[PDB]
Nucleic acid binder design. Structure first.
Ligand SMILES: [Zn+2]
Ligand SMILES: [Zn+2]
Ligand SMILES: [Zn+2]
Ligand SMILES: [Zn+2]
Ligand SMILES: [Zn+2]
Ligand SMILES: [Zn+2]
Ligand SMILES: [Zn+2]
Ligand SMILES: [Zn+2]
Ligand SMILES: [Zn+2]
Ligand SMILES: [Zn+2]
Length: 281
DNA sequence: TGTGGGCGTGGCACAGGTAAAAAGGGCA
DNA sequence: TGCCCTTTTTACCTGTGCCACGCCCACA
């Protein structure tokens, strides 16, 4: 198992990213270097290190002079003061947001103009940044550096290994306020909550009924068209969705999966066993 | 009574956009 | 060494493909 896969071939310290490792390996390469206490990262100025340490210490020295709210970073206080009057404001020409200086207004407005300079060598797609392109390389690489300490299962993101380990331990800390069913991660709870909202953004143009997912709209449209693109290799049957084919194929394998006490009848589905449980109640 | 497909949603490993943190640095 | 920013990396967020259940109804 490895929640931090990027290990130093010089000291063995563990880091969750190549970038973080890269800025630790200053300790052993750079002559003029400044290392942090517990996290073991290095910086090329005391200014920088001391700034970084406020992450551990929780100090917030940059204090607003008229409302008094402290902040961790000059970055942050600078954005805050846009809220009071008498601040140099960089309003977005298009949307409604506002930025403290010009370099970040420019970076935002890359989201309108669609500029994506770092072009992927393989699919030719583009990204707002080098580290994003690095992220997208998961698609061509199929690597899984994050590894479960219980089963050694592989994951592309430490996020996902986290949710998996929560699954192992049965830790579902996201509860649906209305229903009560819990969830290992935040996306699962989000898609569920869509059932209470009635947030069904995909609408059948023909019929009118609305769905949660794009795939359901597809399967509905084909269920009006009659197109069943999923064929059995053995018996030649048709299906609209792959799950119905996969569940079908268990008829071809001898299964006899479930059974009932004192008569032993075998049913391919679990719910069938209930229907037969009604017989002798 | 027994089958079995259509339908709707849960589990899960996952990509990609953007808001936010975090690092980089010229210079007084 | 902090100002005053620029630039890079990460968190937060929202959507998605594939697979499998349980439910409802049509028939056999
Ligand atoms: Zn090292
Ligand atoms: Zn640190
Ligand atoms: Zn204020
Ligand atoms: Zn805008
Ligand atoms: Zn690519
Ligand atoms: Zn595991
Ligand atoms: Zn609920
Ligand atoms: Zn329809
Ligand atoms: Zn078949
Ligand atoms: Zn029985």
């Amino acid at each position: 198992g490895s929640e931090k896969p990027y290990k130093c071939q010089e000291c063995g310290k563990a880091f969750p990213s190549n970038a973080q490792l890269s800025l630790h390996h200053r300790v052993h390469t750079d002559e003029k270097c400044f290392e942090c206490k517990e996290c073991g990262k290095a910086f090329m100025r005391p200014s920088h290190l001391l700034r970084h340490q406020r992450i551990h210490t929780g100090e917030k020295p940059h204090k607003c002079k008229e409302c008094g709210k402290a902040f961790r970073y000059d970055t942050q206080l600078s954005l805050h003061l846009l809220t009071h009057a008498g601040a140099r404001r960089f309003e977005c020409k298009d949307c409604d947001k506002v930025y403290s200086c010009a370099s970040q207004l420019a970076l935002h407005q890359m989201s309108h103009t669609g500029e994506k300079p770092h072009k992927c060598k393989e699919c030719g797609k583009g990204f707002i940044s080098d580290s994003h392109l690095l992220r997208h390389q998961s698609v061509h690489t199929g690597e899984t550096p994050y590894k479960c300490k219980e089963c050694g299962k592989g994951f592309r993101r430490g996020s996902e290994l986290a949710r998996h380990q929560r699954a192992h331990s049965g830790d579902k800390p996201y509860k649906c306020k209305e229903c009560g069913k819990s969830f290992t991660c935040t996306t699962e709870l989000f898609r569920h909550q869509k059932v209470h909202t009635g947030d069904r953004p995909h609408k059948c143009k023909e019929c009118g009924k609305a769905f949660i997912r794009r795939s359901e709209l597809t399967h509905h449209e084909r269920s009006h068209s009659g197109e069943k693109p999923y064929e059995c290799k053995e018996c030649g049957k048709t299906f609209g969705r792959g799950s119905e084919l996969s569940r079908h194929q268990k008829i071809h394998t001898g299964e006899k999966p479930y059974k009932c006490q004192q008569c032993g009848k075998a049913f391919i589905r679990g719910s069938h066993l209930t229907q037969h449980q009604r017989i002798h109640t």
